[PDB]
């Protein structure tokens, strides 16, 4: 039964077929549990299995190296060096890397919780039923229970299933809806049915909802639905039924893997080409597995080369540093991706009540009426001061301060205010200022009673604990209060019926005090109070009164208005309906206007200038809220989000009107919109959809389990600190002070890391293209390995990876925040900034090698020899006349690839300073500006000395230490990196930039 709300009680038993009394026949629970299943969520499958980790294992830019370290590991096997301990280190470190980063990206167990798990919660763990096996009530499991079955609910249990209410044992029944809501006061049931067949869940007066707890009271009901076929189960399908695309960066990631891959494979074909003259050689002149040794450690090299080993340590360790500066700026950012695509945020959806507005309700004008004669009929307008709930405040009219006693209509003003009213006040002294005890509405309500004080009662005499509910009070001993006929939407009002205590004070017999929307109420008022007497409400009356509603509304004010009105010759007690919700507005006519209360809801103090500041940012921002859509545009145009004289005839939409329009009206509204009001539940998911229909990153807001696929949805899902604890599970990031604000100060955050990570991410390439034209360099004209694949681990990893981390700390450029939003596939590295990293990456690979070739050729210490016979050294025991100096083991000496690795780190410095800006030179960004950079370097420089000096070091990673005379020569070379990269910066800034 989907429509159980929309039946009578009598029909939902003859559906299932089921006696109130007796219940469900043991044969009728197989056949229903057969056929509907069990009263459950389905179970997660994919927890911490073995599976973990493999799956980082099966990219392809990580199999390489897998599959490197095993012809490095043939390699490391297959030597005539009888050196123990430094065998097994080239596949070892290669593997050990491997392994530690793929652990760190297997990070998705503390940095990753779950959101349909949390939904698991709800579900209790045993409901009581009353089967026709047995005659008293039996409990049995929660997910046993089948629709159909007599359920029965207390104060305290959680609500099992979506259950049709059949009969209130208790006075009055009360649920806490608050997971499905937001809200918190807990929602009055009754068992009369909900004639719209399409009618919402907060209408659904009937119904209780599965994951619902009873507030108060005690009923018997009939199941309507089990499993997913409830509300928070048709909830769970929505997440379910949704897939989650990883953020643009990590596919820009992947799809570097895979062009990466390409090239590596195409230089180990390209070497494998160049050594074709290898064919037209005597067989009878080596060995073909001299040869299979220098293909497969080339291979190995390559590999090592172009691949950045240390670039998934850098993000990780960036990323988290990110997050720890969004927790101080009250952003808690739940996965490590957010915080990178948190800068590409285009579309910030926010609610009103609570994020951009203090929901500091407070009464700030009233008017009643003074004289009406026919077409004459003037009003008497006053203004209240104190935007608190404490009664520290005045009544003024006309600038003034009044006694609000004075005015008969203000009296029955505050008479109703006190009586129609759930709310309350009390003194806090820990805190040291006054607390709001229930809504917020009908509180700012008790707090203008106080103010007002229409029977003046002593107060300076009183202490703080009794000013809170004094006034209130007083008027309570005038009236006693019979019973409260609660809220509802299809009438949009609320009344409370009082009886005059015995005193003789003088009442026509009962009254009805009614205080609803004015809408409603108004058009209900067939008299009007003026001061004591009674006038009929005529046309020119009605005018007045919606006009000045209207100005308080759509005006600069931007006030709740709320109409109050009185019924004088209520109908008896006997003749009213209690338990009929439905003839509440029935009762609630005849009535006699008395005046209207005008309320505000404050925005902010920093959403003003933060709304102006997604404005300039390219943000744009779209209010959700609950008023009425002209009350909407008012506080729009308040804020900032309009102007305070445009037209936005278009850009806003009630939930109603929204609904009106065909599906490509309605995706055509999404990107021009900028307000909603009234919007029904379903409609958070359906913005969404339309608004990533645009490719538009969107930041949606919400703190219901209404919301949670919403924000599942959504890009960046935002709860807030106070919000459900599925709302947060199912959000991206959580708002500890609830505040507009601070959606945006996270997204400045975000997009300055986001430019600063892309500068290293550019700066590892930057040294990776270098060792593939180094070892390419050295590979295809025949010369001695200038560099060895297990320093290169040391170097990427290291010496360029610490220098990298501190360029996370890169000063955030200034006006950033006056440019429009990263786009989502927007190239890492194209066009000229390729051939920037490639000019650096050529030049390096040329000052490598041209390194160990000086030391080869024009040196001090090293040998006098030519560069023709440098590329034949493979023939130093063959070719005996032609090379001849000293021992052949020169040749494979460690000082020349001590040389190509010191000047690559000499130069990486350099690129690192390089790396302080993208266009701007270094005579205008200062090289000592990012301290941690500074450190950085000096901390790279003294590691390459400590594996220089300390003796266990570089006889593994097989070095020898430079004097002062080799190291003047590392600067000519490295320095000129500095002058070549300023060079394109000055091409860029001047024959690019237009
Ligand atoms: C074994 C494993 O967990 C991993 C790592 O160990 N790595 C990275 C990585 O994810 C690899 C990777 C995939 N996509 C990219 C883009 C840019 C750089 C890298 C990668 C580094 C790759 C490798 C093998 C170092
Ligand atoms: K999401
Ligand atoms: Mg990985």
Not at 703 to 717: H, Q, R, S, T
């Amino acid at each position: 039964m989907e429509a159980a709300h929309s039946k009578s009680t009598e029909e939902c038993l003859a559906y299932f077929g089921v006696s109130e009394t007796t219940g469900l026949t043991p044969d009728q629970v197989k056949r229903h549990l057969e056929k509907y299943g069990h009263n459950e969520l389905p179970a997660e499958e994919g927890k911490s299995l073995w599976e973990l980790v493999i799956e980082q294992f099966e990219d392809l830019l990580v199999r390489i190296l897998l599959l490197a370290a095993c012809i490095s590991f043939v390699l490391a096997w297959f030597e005539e060096g009888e050196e123990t301990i430094t065998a097994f280190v080239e596949p070892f470190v290669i593997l050990l890397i491997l392994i530690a980063n793929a652990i760190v990206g297997v990070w998705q167990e503390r940095n990753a919780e779950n959101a349909i798990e949390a939904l698991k919660e709800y579900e209790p763990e045993m409901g009581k039923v009353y089967r026709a096996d047995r005659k008293s009530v039996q409990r049995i499991k929660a997910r046993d229970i089948v629709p159909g079955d007599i359920v029965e609910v207390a104060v305290g249990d959680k609500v099992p299933a979506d259950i049709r209410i059949l009969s209130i044992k208790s006075t009055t029944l009360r649920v806490d809806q608050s997971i499905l809501t937001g809200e918190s006061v807990s929602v009055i049931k009754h068992t009369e049915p909900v004639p719209d067949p399409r009618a919402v869940n907060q209408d659904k007066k009937n119904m209780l909802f599965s994951g619902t707890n009873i507030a108060a009271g005690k009923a018997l009901g009939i199941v309507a639905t089990t499993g997913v076929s409830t509300e928070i189960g048709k909830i769970r399908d929505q997440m379910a039924a949704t897939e989650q695309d990883k953020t643009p960066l990590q596919q820009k990631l992947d799809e570097f893997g895979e062009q990466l891959s390409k090239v590596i494979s195409l230089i180990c074909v390209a070497v494998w080409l160049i050594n074709i003259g290898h064919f037209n050689d005597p067989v009878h002149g080596g060995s073909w597995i001299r040869g299979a040794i220098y293909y497969f450690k080339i291979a190995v090299a390559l590999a090592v080369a172009a691949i950045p080993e240390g670039l998934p340590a850098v993000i990780t360790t960036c990323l988290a540093l990110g997050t720890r500066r969004m927790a101080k700026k009250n952003a808690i950012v739940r996965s490590l991706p957010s915080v990178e695509t948190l800068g590409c945020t285009s579309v910030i959806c926010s609610d009103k009540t609570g994020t951009l507005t203090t929901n500091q309700m407070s009464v700030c004008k009233m008017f009643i009426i003074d004289k009406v004669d026919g077409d004459f009929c003037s009003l008497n307008e006053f203004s209240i001061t104190g935007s608190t709930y404490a009664p520290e405040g005045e009544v003024l009219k006309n600038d003034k301060p009044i006694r609000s006693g004075q005015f008969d209509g203000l009296v029955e003003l505050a008479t109703i205010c006190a009586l129609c009213n759930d709310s309350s006040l009390d003194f806090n002294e820990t805190k040291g200022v006054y607390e709001k005890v229930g809504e917020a509405t009908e509180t700012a309500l008790t707090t203008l009673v106080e103010k007002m004080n229409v029977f003046n009662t002593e107060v300076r005499n009183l202490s703080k604990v009794e000013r809170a509910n004094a006034c209130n009070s007083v008027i309570r001993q005038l009236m006693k209060k019979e019973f409260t006929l609660e809220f509802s939407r299809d009438r949009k009002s609320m009344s409370v019926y009082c009886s005059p205590a015995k005193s003789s004070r003088a009442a026509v017999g009962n009254k009805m005090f009614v205080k609803g929307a004015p809408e409603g109420v108004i058009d209900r008022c067939n008299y009007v109070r003026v001061g004591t007497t009674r006038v009929p409400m005529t046309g020119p009356v009605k005018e007045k009164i919606l006009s000045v509603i209207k100005e308080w509304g759509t005006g600069r004010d931007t006030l709740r208005c709320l109409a109050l009105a009185t019924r004088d010759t209520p109908p008896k007690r006997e003749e009213m309906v209690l338990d009929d919700s439905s003839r509440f507005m029935e009762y609630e006519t005849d009535l006699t206007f008395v005046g209207v209360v005008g309320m505000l809801d404050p925005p902010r103090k920093e959403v003003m200038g933060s709304i102006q500041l997604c404005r300039d940012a390219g943000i744009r921002v779209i209010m959700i809220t609950g008023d009425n859509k002209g009350t909407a545009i008012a506080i729009c145009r308040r804020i900032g989000i309009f102007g305070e004289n445009e037209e936005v005839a278009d850009r806003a939409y009630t939930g109603r009107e929204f609904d009106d329009l065909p599906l490509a009206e309605q995706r055509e509204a999404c990107r021009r919109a900028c307000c909603f009001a009234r919007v029904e539940p379903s409609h958070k998911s359906k913005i969404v959809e339309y608004l990533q229909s645009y490719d538009e990153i969107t930041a949606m807001t919400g703190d219901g389990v209404n919301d949670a696929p919403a924000l599942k949805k959504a890009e960046i899902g935002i709860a807030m600190g106070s919000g459900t604890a599925v709302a947060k599970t199912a959000s991206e990031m959580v708002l500890a002070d609830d505040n507009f604000s601070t959606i945006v100060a996270a997204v400045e955050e975000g997009r300055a890391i986001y430019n600063n990570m892309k500068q290293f991410i550019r700066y590892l390439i930057s040294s990776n293209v270098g060792e593939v034209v180094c070892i390419f360099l050295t590979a295809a004209l025949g010369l001695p390995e200038a560099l060895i694949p297990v320093q290169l681990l040391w170097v990427n990893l290291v010496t360029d990876g610490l220098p990298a981390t501190a360029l996370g700390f890169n000063p955030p450029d200034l006006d950033i925040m006056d440019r429009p939003p990263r786009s989502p596939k927007e190239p890492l590295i194209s066009g000229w900034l390729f051939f920037r990293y490639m000019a650096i990456g050529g030049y390096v690979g040329a000052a490598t090698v041209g390194a160990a070739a000086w030391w080869f050729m024009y040196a001090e210490d090293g040998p006098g020899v030519t560069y023709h016979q440098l590329t034949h050294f493979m023939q130093c025991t063959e070719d005996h006349p032609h090379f001849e100096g000293l021992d052949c083991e020169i040749f494979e000496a460690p000082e020349p690839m001590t040389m190509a690795l010191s000047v690559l780190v000499t130069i990486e410095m350099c690129n690192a300073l390089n790396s302080l800006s993208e266009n701007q030179s270094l005579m205008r960004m200062p090289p000592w500006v990012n301290i941690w950079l500074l450190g950085s370097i000096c901390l790279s420089m003294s590691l390459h000395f400590l594996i220089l000096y300390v003796d266990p070091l570089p006889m593994i990673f097989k070095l020898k230490a430079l004097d002062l005379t080799q190291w003047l020569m590392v600067l000519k070379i490295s320095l000129p990196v500095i002058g070549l990269d300023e060079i394109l910066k000055f091409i860029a800034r001047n024959y690019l930039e237009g």
